[PDB]
From TrEMBL, chains C, D, E, F:
The chain holds residues 316 to 653 of 657 of the full protein. Acetyl-CoA binds at residues 97, 100, 143, 147, 176-178, 245, 280, 283-284. GO terms for molecular function: acyltransferase activity; malate dehydrogenase (decarboxylating) (NADP+) activity; metal ion binding; NAD binding. Keywords: Metal-binding, Nucleotide-binding, Oxidoreductase. Its EC number is 1.1.1.40. It comes from the Bacteria. The gene is mdh. This is Malate dehydrogenase.
């Protein structure tokens, strides 16, 4: 319901941004050229003029799988087999340059570049595509690895999953929901800032709460970690409301925060919730999904230099649609920053 | 919703009928608490317990009248040091903790604390249950309970919350006590939750929650996989499974489609969390940002009936605690009468 | 023996004479304690302090009347929740501990505890010193002191004992607070003891005790050696040495024959112990075995004058603590006006 | 004071009586030491042992001549490498430590060291006991005793001191060997101390010392409580209690008044310490600044009778050590012949 | 040199001539590799195995013609998803790892990987051995083998190399898998190499190598000493010794002069290294500067016969490896019939 | 091979001919050793050093006579305790180690050991080099050298071996001292090896050895990579690279073909090992089964020239050690007169 309001508003901004650039659409690579869910979503994606999809694989198999699934809009989409691309050898040359002191010889580099995930990542790194969406078939850790090795993180950034809680009027941002098992205080602050930047993109003032099982106790263990994380974040970005350690009801409810912790600098309820570990975040957002009838989209990958996202294995087809939009939006924002 | 608490009160009447008509004696250490007194008005008319307030009768009668509560003008009030059994309670506490740093003077000083006195009352049979902690933090309120009343054989103190949906309920544990429970501790927490589900004539189906789906990967995945295995060996008749994610756990369709080998069929109703961060954050987010009725926490694993309120408790919240404290007291009373 | 307490008391008179005749205000949280009131009989006659009792005026006057103590029926008595500054005290404790798990209501409940109120009186200047802990275990009695008053910069809380000999006294630390002090902590504990020795006009000679003689071997030998090195860099004018055994420390004849290189000349008067096992056992053995007088313990390292009595303290003990609390209060006032 | 050593001598002669009139053979590795020879003078009139001095007989006879000591000019003197059994002693040491880093050549080099040769003499029955180490530090001097003679089954090397008061005595352990004994090790130390107490016909009453009174708190309190439990299980006829403070341990009035549940009634006489820092500091502080005769340390837990002198040992010290080495040698031989 | 491969090849013919004349089936996942096909040319003349290539038959026949290798125009070629047992293979991989993070779809994706299919072919008996990894790094190439085929009870995957001298040969382990094996792991590794030496009718003599000679000191001495003990108790008939230095192990004359007690007599022929750093550096230095022929690595410890080539392997390497894969396949089949 | 030792002697004569003709005084603590005396015979005709033997002059002259070696019947002989400077040597050791558990008496006992006395001779300028330890294990023989002579600023004691090939040589370090050098320590080891290569006028090219090729993976790969990086920053003119396997390091063809990005061109001549297990095992295996001439170990990183013979030393081995001790002593002298 609200998610369809949100995806629409997102798609509308995609069109807004494709205007102001000649009309060009972002080139998105899909390493899983024969995935059923991916192909089904590509049907919806090309009518909404969100991207130029690029499938990876043998042109015969993908056209066969496209014909088998009975999908009409896809008979003109660009398809690439990695090792056959004109720029293949130079991509191998580049990967070898990147990882030759991290245990990758020349032959391993070729063998890797024939892997669709690595080729897709290099396409984005080298500017031959604008973004990529992978991982509907392999586990997160395996899917995000070629992205991190090829594309890498920007300075001081950290790869971190981010989910949206779609409410009636506003939204919440949850991080990190996919990557860091047990982030330190320094890592949590960085995760906090990366979520805040995304909130700023929607023109909303970010208000960040570092979650714990405690209210401002700073006790040894995760309370001190989340307290220090709030302190680190505030020193790194003094214009923002960042607070912790605090419980989740205190974070989202401005009434509880006011009555019980008037000294707190977080006023008006948080819209960014930073979790102390992957257990609490992954369990939290999946329980919100299943039990409280509430809308959840994501995860969307933050902290990487170029536009890339990783889909979960249990992803829905709308999941891939949502993921491709955020990949498209991200790709466009990076291009604007690059020119400036 | 409210249907659940209504059904609970009926079960209390059901048990008190067939037991003379007697109500359980519940002592409340915070005799001058505003919230406690306000809730007790609702409670005695519902015939849930014989309340026993602790404190100076002078202060308590002032606080009762100042708030203007008519139903309470004859309910029992006790000051610890004036009670006939005060001195023997001291000698019992000193006996319990004399090799844990408590000298005789320290025991007297402690036994004057309403929390310790209430706990000793339940331990000695001078009351049937107690409810504390509306004014102090969880840790400080549960300490006298664990030192005086203690844990039963193989038990572990663990808080349990109910997620009330429109058809059935889910139970969450441990939501209040254990920071980072071991595989062995998780298994026991699962078993304690399972019995509370069984009291409701519901088949327990237990999921050991994780961020992973049957990965057994090193870390909390392996811990929850082991917890499920330990629990299954202690109670082979129960559906106990893990490690698994929360959506996989509660949704029987996802479990069926994606993990058919799993022994957990029909969606879990007991959720065991890997650590206090995940459980506290989960159930509080379910409350605040979902339309979901969550009641609790209720303390499991203790030898006698005692429950601890949260500092942020509501008045119905205190009613809920008193109902399950009464129910627990009645169940424990029945087991003892066959032992 | 008693000589030491007399000279201490007379030095209290010196300072009150040199400051108008005013006495330091001492708060006693346990206003109805039998031992405390008995000691206060001796103290108010000796013009040591202005006592301030905490409790309900009724009960303390009952216990005074019951104990048949005539001298105390006019002494200042305060019930915490009735003092005018009670609520502003609550706000101050809340201001201190709001990010340490204390909400506003909790601060009120704490501030009604005579110990927390006594500490707050001292921190806020409504009194100059406090003496607590005749009824609760050390950790519980010292907690409000550390949370409210806190330590001065770079300081560390440490119990300190005097071994009263014929000619001189020895100072033992840390005898009550730190389970297993680090090398950095030992140096500080030593420096805190040395100042106390200097107050008595004795040149401090400090030994970091160990089971070893200048071996520096891994473990507490290396720790006590390193501690002495830290202390020396902070105070190059002091005799500080270690690691060394205790007979080496107190007996200069052993030092002479076997370790001439040691910079410790003339036998120690400050003994710093490597851990609480060794210090508590040592001073408790000196007491029972060997008729040697031990007074104390006295708390060092706190910003304002505060002392914790042992639970099983005698009346002479409470007298000693107040004298040290008065003297500490007088010294702190002289330091403050600078 | 002196009464203890007197009664000890009386027991040595009592044991030599009812055993032929023969005295135990004690070897002294430091054959040219002045202090040792001076004590052997006092010792040989008391007919405590047959001394065996190690060294070159020429130098040794010269040093005895120089010091003007008439009684020692007919005592046994041995040069290690000249002894008939020297090389077979080498073969036995090599047999013991060849998988612990000692080849045949190192065994030769080692067996020439008088301490190693003394230990091997005692182990192989060429002597009954040894007293060594008057010139080198404890750790290095006790090493050959442990490498050669070793511990009895389940025993643990542990030093023991006596605190002599005028009515009774106290026993302190372990004051020389174990830095940080586990709870099991403390229990074993406790048992070894108890056996020595029984040898003097006194009922052993054992206290596991800590900084806490029956607190069982994490750390050394739990360790010492656990140790007391293990000791009680191995010797249920003994009074063994802990964790407890030292004054609680030695003063029966405190134990009664404050800890009536405690099974330790009538004051402790075996004090087991939680770590070496506390034991060494405690007993040296008792000696240096208390009126208390302290003798020892005596090494317990080893298979055959051997004792190590401390560097600060007096000549009267060497007398006491050899007296107890004798008693240990007589008892240990009697157990073997049973 | 060449002698060694010849004796092995003839041993392959001996066992096939005594088991009907059949050859063991070997799967090669990298069916279009130049080096793999080049070695298979040499092999098919020598009648060592039935080769089974994995890949698209078209590409493999194309590559066969291109490389101008005439002998291979009839060898079995299989495309994984086209094999009849493909889907039951998927279901079998799924049954093994469904509680190890692999769902059904992931299993299908994996089973199309030639390395995973080859392992499953071996596990299910559609082949007797496999040789992989001529293009990928060791760790990634060994993983499907360990996940699918696995280890026999108490075994441990361990790389093993032969140092070919002209009279005898030496065996080095573990040269590929374990970074820092425990003492138990070393013991098991030693036993696995020992079984291979026995297969050649040579009485095995095993050295647990260290930087030390029988010191047993904390660290790697203690580890290798304990490892030898564990191995000896598991296999009392074998000459197993350690800890010892390398020359002590391989030079029996040094062992004689300096360590006669060592149970290792005649110079070792099995060298077990304490960690991968020492073994990898040792054998590669033996290879490069010492004129010394080195073959391997060959993988030990797995339930069925499988071997991993290094990515940088030569063509003779593939020949040797397949010979060893065949011998292992034959032996394991005989063990299965027992 | 034999050329290298010969060429080395020529530099001894060149440097001595460039300093008057004086030869370095080398003290040998094992004065009655047969192997040592025999080597001195070969050495003294080559005018390499002035030997200084330690021991009783009576015995050493007997042993030289009995052994029938004419060239040594006037070489300097010293009995340590008879030396005029003996007691001041004691005082200096005492000055060095008094806060490391050595009192005056322990210092005397040590200084009677020829090794400690020889080291003190070199520290005090009574000699220019020493060569010891043909009878004791490395650790015990190298200990007095480090305690007395010590390390130069920022240096680290590290053993170094030469692998003599017929065109060039390799240097292996650290093959005797450091169990598990940190990345900083490895870098320092490399720099010290690099210095010695330069003394021979060869451009040093350093490879940090590992089980990995440029993987930087956690563990010893990351350690050696960081080590290579630290060294490059401290000595930017040198080819220093890592982590890399041993064959990659020594074979320039592999480095070219497989790691063209590597800054190490033309094959390594300095190999720094990650730990003592690998370095000790590597070179002894090179020695025994690679039948490659390997000399050393030679101790680097010490302030004055000192070397330790191995227990397994040959007579020519002692010669090689003495020659380099002479060279080191000469080099150290030139630097001192800067």
């Amino acid at each position: 319901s609200h998610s369809k309001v949100f995806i629409r508003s997102a798609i509308n901004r995609v069109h807004q941004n494709s205007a102001a650039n000649g009309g060009e659409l972002p080139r998105i690579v899909f390493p899983e050229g024969t995935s059923t869910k991916v192909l089904k979503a590509l049907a919806t994606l090309v009518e909404e003029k969100i991207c130029q999809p690029i499938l990876l694989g043998y042109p015969e198999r993908v056209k066969e799988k496209i014909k088998a699934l009975d999908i009409p809009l896809l008979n003109d989409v660009s398809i690439v087999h990695p090792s056959s691309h004109p720029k293949y050898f130079s991509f191998v040359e580049k990967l070898y340059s990147l990882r030759q002191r991290k245990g990758i010889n020349l032959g391993e580099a070729e063998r890797l570049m024939a892997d669709p995930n690595y080729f897709a990542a290099m396409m984005v790194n080298q500017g031959e595509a604008d973004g990529m969406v992978s991982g509907s078939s392999i586990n997160y850790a395996d899917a995000v690895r070629p992205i991190l090795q090829t594309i890498g993180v920007y300075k001081e950034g950290i790869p971190a999953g981010l989910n949206f809680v779609l409410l009636e009027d506003k939204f919440l941002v949850l991080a990190d929901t996919t990557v860091n098992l047990n982030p330190t205080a320094e890592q949590c602050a960085q995760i906090a800032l990366q979520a805040a930047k995304i909130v700023e993109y929607f023109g909303i003032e970010p208000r960040v709460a570092m979650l714990s099982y405690s209210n401002f106790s700073g006790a040894e263990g995760t309370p001190r970690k989340m307290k220090k994380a709030a302190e680190i974040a505030r020193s790194l970005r003094p214009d923002l409301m960042i607070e912790g350690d605090m419980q989740a009801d205190t974070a989202v409810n401005p009434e509880i925060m006011e009555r019980l912790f008037p000294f707190s600098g977080l006023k008006g309820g948080a819209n960014v919730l930073v979790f102390p570990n992957l257990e609490s975040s992954d369990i939290a957002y999946k329980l919100i999904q299943q039990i409280g009838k509430a809308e959840v989209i994501g995860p969307f990958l933050t902290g990487v230099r170029r536009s890339a996202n990783v889909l979960q294995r249990t992803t829905t087809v709308d999941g891939i649609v949502n993921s491709v939009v955020f990949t498209a939006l991200e790709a466009q924002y990076i291009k604007e920053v690059l020119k400036s």
